[PDB]
Each structure stands twice: as C-alpha cells, then as structure tokens.
Write a protein that binds this ligand. Structure first.
Ligand code: QG9
Lengths: 99, 99
C-alpha cells in the first residue's frame, strides 16, 4: 500500500505472537523495540540516537510481521518511547520512498 | 523517482543560503538540523529521541529546496548528531512510503 506522511506512519506488527504498534522509520539503520520477551540468546550493542547512546539486547533471526508482510531478522530491545522499524526490516518487506 | 532503502536515504538540501546533507526520516515529526543561523522568530523546546532529550530552537515558515522542490516548513535547530528531514517537509514534496 501507499502511506502518506501527514500523520506518523504507525502500523501493526506481530512478534512473539503478539500485536504491537510500531513506527516505520527510514532514518533508522536498525529496529528498536520496547521491553518484551524473546527466545534464545542475545548479544550486546550500543546504538546512537539524537539524544545520545543506549545499550540494547540484540536478538537475531527473529520472525516478525509488519503490515502483514513476513520478515525474519535482527531486533534490538532497549529503552525507547516507541517501537521503531528500521531499514534492516523495511528492505525485507520491499518498502521504498517515492515522490 | 523511487528511493530504495538498502542505504541511508541521504539528500542535499538548500537552506539559509547553505547546502547541507540530510537523512530522509519518516520517523521524524519535523526536520532537525545541526547548529546554524536562521532568520525570524523561534521558540525553545525539548525533543526526546533515543538516548534522551536535547534542546532545540523551533523556526517556522523557513524556505527549503529539496529534491528539486521549493518547499516551506518548520526547522528545529540544535545539537543533533545527524541532520534529518521530517514529515513536516516530506509531505510538501509528495513523499510517500510504498510496499
Ligand atoms: C546509525 O544510527 C541510527 O540509525 N540510529 C537510529 C536513530 O536514532 N536514527 N536517527 C533517525 C531517527 C530519529 C528518531 C527515532 C525515534 C526515537 C524514539 C521514538 C520514535 C522514533 C527521533 O529521534 N525522533 C524524535 C524527534 C524528531 C523530530 C521532532 C520530534 C522528535 C521526538 C522523537 O520522536 C523521531 C525519529 O526521527 C538518525 C540518526 C543517525 C545517527 C546518529 C548517531 C551516529 C553516530 N554517533 C551518535 C549518533 C543519531 C541519529 C536508532 C533508532 C537505531 C537509534
């Protein structure tokens, strides 16, 4: 579908069998999610945002649906006011910018 | 044209008689640029991104040339580690997300 930007591009995602609201963010290299439970082991990562750096838990090869589109990739769990879907997953669903 | 997201969507804009590189960011409500001078009135505010909040100066009705388009919008000026073009300006050039 085509999503205009007059409002925040919030969509529904599904991860771990649960539905959550997330923001499609072309300015993010990675996908950052609010605290939640994920399987397996995690690795450390330090990411930088507009306000500074934060530590997150990196989980790999995690199944996740975005607007009904299936993806499997890396998700980072840490302190954020909203779930952010970055380019690592936007490319998996074939998302592009157009004008 | 169509912009894929395999790489960061960087563009060159013209503002205040200056040329700056900026990231097309669908997650940003408004454009945020590193310290620079802008004419007109402004009001201070705090924006909270990943890593915490930063203080910025909000300028409205600022002329900006982007992707061959002469648009007008709001610009937040402050200590951001990266320049980003937000929805406030992206809408004016008819930019949309598609997948
Ligand atoms: C390479 O790094 C990244 O891609 N980082 C991601 C990120 O923040 N990307 N920024 C781009 C994305 C910004 C949003 C992320 C967001 C955060 C919380 C809740 C919802 C959305 C951000 O900070 N936003 C805030 C914003 C902006 C304008 C006006 C108001 C407000 C309030 C917030 O919503 C919205 C997005 O634009 C650009 C950027 C690139 C490099 C460095 C860096 C580089 C090197 N050293 C230091 C900093 C700092 C910033 C992230 C999400 C993975 C942390």
């Amino acid at each position: 579908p085509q999503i205009t930007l007059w409002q925040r591009p919030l969509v529904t995602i599904k991860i771990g069998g649960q539905l959550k609201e997330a923001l499609l963010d072309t300015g993010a290299d990675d996908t950052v999610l609010e605290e939640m439970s994920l399987p397996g082991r995690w690795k450390p990562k330090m990411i930088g945002g507009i306000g500074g750096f934060i530590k997150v838990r990196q989980y790999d090869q995690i199944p996740i649906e975005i607007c009904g589109h299936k993806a499997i990739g890396t998700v980072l769990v840490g302190p954020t006011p909203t779930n952010v879907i970055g380019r690592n997953l936007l490319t998996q669903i074939g998302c592009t910018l157009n004008f």
